[PDB]
Design a protein around this motif. Sequence first.
Motif, PDB file in Angstrom:
ATOM      1  N   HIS A 247      -0.732  -0.220   8.367  1.00  0.00           N
ATOM      2  CA  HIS A 247      -1.698  -0.366   7.327  1.00  0.00           C
ATOM      3  C   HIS A 247      -2.537  -1.569   7.826  1.00  0.00           C
ATOM      4  O   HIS A 247      -3.837  -1.689   7.339  1.00  0.00           O
TER       5      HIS A 247
ATOM      6  N   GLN B  89      -6.761   1.317  -3.287  1.00  0.00           N
ATOM      7  CA  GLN B  89      -7.083  -0.068  -2.329  1.00  0.00           C
ATOM      8  C   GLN B  89      -6.897  -1.137  -3.214  1.00  0.00           C
ATOM      9  O   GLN B  89      -7.203  -2.351  -2.577  1.00  0.00           O
TER      10      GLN B  89
ATOM     11  N   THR C  44      -9.580  -5.879  -0.556  1.00  0.00           N
ATOM     12  CA  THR C  44      -8.493  -5.255  -0.270  1.00  0.00           C
ATOM     13  C   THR C  44      -7.430  -6.216   0.864  1.00  0.00           C
ATOM     14  O   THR C  44      -6.482  -6.460   0.766  1.00  0.00           O
TER      15      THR C  44
ATOM     16  N   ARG D 133      -9.886   3.567  -5.035  1.00  0.00           N
ATOM     17  CA  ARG D 133     -10.188   2.230  -5.432  1.00  0.00           C
ATOM     18  C   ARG D 133      -8.896   1.752  -6.097  1.00  0.00           C
ATOM     19  O   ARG D 133      -8.457   0.548  -5.845  1.00  0.00           O
TER      20      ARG D 133
ATOM     21  N   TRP E 260      -7.534   3.794   3.030  1.00  0.00           N
ATOM     22  CA  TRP E 260      -8.526   3.105   3.528  1.00  0.00           C
ATOM     23  C   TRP E 260     -10.008   3.573   3.781  1.00  0.00           C
ATOM     24  O   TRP E 260     -11.008   3.100   4.192  1.00  0.00           O
TER      25      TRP E 260
ATOM     26  N   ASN F 103      -8.700  -2.330  -5.656  1.00  0.00           N
ATOM     27  CA  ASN F 103     -10.047  -2.893  -5.819  1.00  0.00           C
ATOM     28  C   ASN F 103     -10.024  -3.660  -7.000  1.00  0.00           C
ATOM     29  O   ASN F 103      -9.526  -3.157  -8.173  1.00  0.00           O
TER      30      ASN F 103
ATOM     31  N   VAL G  22       0.870  -1.202   0.046  1.00  0.00           N
ATOM     32  CA  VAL G  22      -0.004   0.003  -0.082  1.00  0.00           C
ATOM     33  C   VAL G  22       0.912   1.370  -0.023  1.00  0.00           C
ATOM     34  O   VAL G  22       0.486   2.414  -0.537  1.00  0.00           O
TER      35      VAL G  22
ATOM     36  N   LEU H 148      -6.319  -1.428   8.527  1.00  0.00           N
ATOM     37  CA  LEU H 148      -7.357  -2.440   7.865  1.00  0.00           C
ATOM     38  C   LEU H 148      -8.252  -3.152   8.585  1.00  0.00           C
ATOM     39  O   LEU H 148      -9.401  -3.484   8.386  1.00  0.00           O
TER      40      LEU H 148
ATOM     41  N   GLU I 150     -15.469  -4.231  -0.891  1.00  0.00           N
ATOM     42  CA  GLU I 150     -14.277  -3.758  -1.203  1.00  0.00           C
ATOM     43  C   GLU I 150     -13.201  -3.824  -0.221  1.00  0.00           C
ATOM     44  O   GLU I 150     -12.143  -4.004  -0.607  1.00  0.00           O
ATOM     45  N   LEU I 151     -13.485  -3.615   1.050  1.00  0.00           N
ATOM     46  CA  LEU I 151     -12.469  -4.083   2.218  1.00  0.00           C
ATOM     47  C   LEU I 151     -12.059  -5.324   2.067  1.00  0.00           C
ATOM     48  O   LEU I 151     -10.994  -5.590   2.337  1.00  0.00           O
TER      49      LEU I 151
END
Lengths: 348, 28, 50, 501, 172, 120, 62
Positions: free
Chosen positions: F24, A203, F49, A200, A155, A205, A26, F28, F45-46
């Motif tokens: 992170h 992330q 991830t 996104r 996030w 996605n 990330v 999360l 979506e999470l």
Amino acid sequence: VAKLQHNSAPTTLNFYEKSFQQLSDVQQRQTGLLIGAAVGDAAARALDGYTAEEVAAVAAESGSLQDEDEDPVVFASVTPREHKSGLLRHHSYTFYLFSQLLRVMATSRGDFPVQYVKNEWVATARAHPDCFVREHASLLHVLCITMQLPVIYPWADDSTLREYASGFLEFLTETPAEQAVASREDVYAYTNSVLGVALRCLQSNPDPYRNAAFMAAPGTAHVFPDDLALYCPPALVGSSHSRTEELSETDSETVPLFPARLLESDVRVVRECLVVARGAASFAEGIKAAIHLGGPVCQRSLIVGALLGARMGVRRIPISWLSATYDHVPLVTLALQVAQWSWNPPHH
Amino acid sequence: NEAEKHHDLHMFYTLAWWKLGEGIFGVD
Amino acid sequence: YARGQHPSYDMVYAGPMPEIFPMRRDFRKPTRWDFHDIEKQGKYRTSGPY
Amino acid sequence: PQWDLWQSRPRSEDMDEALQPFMDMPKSLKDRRYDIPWWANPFGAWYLQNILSLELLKLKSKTNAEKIATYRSYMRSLASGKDNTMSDDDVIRNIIKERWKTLEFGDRNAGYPCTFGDYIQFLNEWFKSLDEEGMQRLREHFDRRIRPLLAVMSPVDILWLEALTQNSPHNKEQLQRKIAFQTSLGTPEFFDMSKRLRYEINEDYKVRDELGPELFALWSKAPERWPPERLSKMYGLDFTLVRKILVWHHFKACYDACVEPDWSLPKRLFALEWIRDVRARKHGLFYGKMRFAEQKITFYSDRFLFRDLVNRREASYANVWEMDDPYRFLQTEQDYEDYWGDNYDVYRRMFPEMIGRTGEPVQQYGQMPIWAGPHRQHANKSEHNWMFAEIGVNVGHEALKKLELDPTNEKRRRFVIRQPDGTLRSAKMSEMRAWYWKEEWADFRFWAPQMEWGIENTPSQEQYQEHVPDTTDADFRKQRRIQSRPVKWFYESEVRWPDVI
Amino acid sequence: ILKKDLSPSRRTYHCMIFMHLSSGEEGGTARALRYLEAMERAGIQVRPSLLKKIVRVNNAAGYKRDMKRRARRIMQAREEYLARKEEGRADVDAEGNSILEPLAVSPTSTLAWWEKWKRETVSKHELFTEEGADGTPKGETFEEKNEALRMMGITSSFQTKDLVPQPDRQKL
Amino acid sequence: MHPRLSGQGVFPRYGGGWMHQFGHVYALQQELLNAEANNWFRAMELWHTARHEGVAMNVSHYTNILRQCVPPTAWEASLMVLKQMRRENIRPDVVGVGCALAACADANRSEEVEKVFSCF
Amino acid sequence: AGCRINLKATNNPKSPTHTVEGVFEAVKALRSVSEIAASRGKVPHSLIYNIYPYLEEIRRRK
């Protein structure tokens, strides 16, 4: 594995080449957003203002390739038609404001109000009056400025990012006089939708463009690609009422002057940038496709390369292009500081 | 320092093992 | 956080092995770039896992 | 061209002898020796005539039936009609066995096929003609077959076998005359143990050279699907032995293909063992092993320590490998080779716990302006890296190394490095940790992202807000924010965009 | 517990704890500690033998936990591979100078055979489509191993478990 | 626009006590386990991830996802969650299966309600 | 084990019989952990091992 040492080949091609390995996934994507934006802007600065046919003519003229040089369109050696003084020689006014915001963010070490950068932005506007009126209160300009806001907290959901970016967008679309700039809500909505795309991408996605189209702001179906425009929410009846109120002025002789480039044209450019980023398999080819489209190539690259960096991290950005970037050292240092401090701000 | 060449291992092949092993030299 | 020292208990010692023989007593090596010479000098009790 | 056993390749003359008596053979008699084909020796001729021809008979030819008819007739004469149903290959094997058994050593022209000296010469030259692979196969044959017999047979039996080999009448009479020599011979009931010993040796060799290819193929194709632990569990083999077999197979393939072996493989298969055991050893010094890394309190002493250890073990890998999550920071093959080759020791000693990297990113600072102008720009360049580390009242605490080296610390210890070109950069993780007392341990199990969350682990905002952080109560946070934020607004004395018409 | 109003025995508590520890799913040790603290607050005897067996069983079930964790990434990689399938000078350096190149290895060498086998066999993502019944990758059973070797073009000589030499039976 | 909890003090001892390399991961996990979330799209979506990042997800995260999916009546999302849980062999909690059943029932998906009830 | 012998009090300190007799008497006067635990009524393992459940063994049964 190893090759015999000869011709004194340098060990590392850039200062941060092996430093980019020292980030999480990330963090790599966070730094990649900023670094790819900078690299794209620096690569498209040479042909800034050029048209599509002019870019094609340049590419055809520089048709003597030695199988190792970069694409002639990227970092072209054409004579400058602008001759800027000290910094806009290698970048644009939009990237100047972007870099100022990045430095303010790095020194803030987390979230920060817009007042921390108001004075820097107005000082830059005063220093460059022609650029300010040329690219003030436009969708491309405000989007390229606010692209780096989701880097603060990847996030974060769409609601939080939009709420945080509202303060910046208000000042970005705030005319000095009472010019009554219209379509402020439209600019806000389109910027929010693209910021959702970028969030996104950060992330990672699956199909960030599709999911951002699903969760886009209402009335913003024209900015996404036509195959994804079906998933966008329909236009709001409140937006229609606001349009009716704007039309109720019945003042044709009054024309706004700060939004020089039309909002529809900005939407078309952003749509082309989104389709290029979606269909690009590598950063180099994505930047080449962005610059081949002509027009505001600087902002086109500042969007496309930022999206590509957010998608595929720092290490996919060509290190040769990164070294060719003029202010790569300060930009990468600020990006690293932001990536480190985003996960534990001192204030909270 | 000197490497052990294990030449004493070869001396065991000089004993006519076919008398007892009944042709162990070949594949079996 | 006020219990024990470290929660690992799966540590793999990565340092030099102790010299059992001839089991030197003192190591007062004059150094040039050692900034912990103050702590290194001095009598210390040698009692550990080993 | 093509060289094989049938047509012996030309070898160097200065080669050392293989058998001991040829090492003491005089130089004149060494020079007397001729250069002849292998079958020119009487023992080689005997082998080619008796055993090698019958081995070749199984190949497709025209005289196979012609010789098989005679051999079958001989077998029928031997064993009436029972051996008619025996297969032709069985008949050939029986004939080979009988000819091997009936071999005798004596006078060349008195009936015996070849002499003992000729047999010794043939053995010596056959050993000389072998390469490294040939000698390895010879030792494998020795271990498979001859070693159990040696382990099960007495020296008296060995001397009796030597007397039989030489076939000297007077020497055999002398050896048989002795009563103790007669009584000291071994018994077949005890010699039967050689069968089981040979079976065990052949079982280990079969394990190696038959389950090595299968395990190697599985682990090379899908190492994550078939880790060494899974392979050992499913094949019943030893967990260490599976990895040893894989390493041996790969190294032997490299050596017999004349390619530099992948030195990283033993590290990649014994990463924990490499850090734990492999050490540099001085001459004449005896070393020891640390049972525990440090003097700590055992987790059985308190109920909370026990829970902490079981949770950490749950979050920890049982056996970490090259493809697991902690090694996902090696994107490309350059990173892979750099981490696993010639620098794995330092790369693993840099930080004890396994994190998603090996150090910290390095960022460079900006030089303070020098009012002296270009009269002094050169002075900050030198021939060496000038490394500076902060010390003081709040800096240098060994117990606070992690918090002082945490990059997200406002009071982080300040390091600077001036390069020989004047560039001011930060310090690496190893450079920063070099100033503290050394830590020489490693963790190969715990992986933070696998920690339990939700069940029994739920950090709460109430616990953090129990401290009641109030901006109106304490304003040091606002002071630090003011210190951090820019100050260029002070020279302008509401912010508004410029107006141009 | 709730319906018949019975007090579970310490053997029952041990069985539940060991079941959850052996189960490689996430939170198994958390549920085991829940059972242990239920014993502690209900007055059930806690034994050092129980603690030692808890530690040993957790260390043993670490293998199954690792296998499930690897299976998750294996499934992700298989999905990515399917998505990729759907989507679709040796002796001269950059300057142009002629550089040394190693001589070709013997084509009959076992190392060359291994290289060609790795380059030409099916990819590791197409060996099995569906994964194991319980969170673990397929290929642990001998049938699945033989199927995978057949797909890779190798006929396994050790078809059955008993056909493995099993060197742990050696007594001499 | 910040992680819910800062590094110092809140994280458990056995996990290293705020290993800053995994800030992170900590953020999360907090985003996955927040009980004030009501956006099922955000939950999915999470989850994607976290799967990409390698975060170990237990039954609590799936239960939270199902709870978020219930109010918008995301029966298809609940079925996808159940399919993933059975694929990875994670036993759904009673609360989670109740959430899936309620999400299916509020959409008048009686066949899916019957299937899920027969399964559990 | 560790053994310390002092024969200064004896009239003849250089007495090997004194040395061996003293060592054997010290060995004889030694109780094993099993015997000590049997006499006390405790488990022998809950006398030399640092396990927290053993803390209940040194309390009074209530």
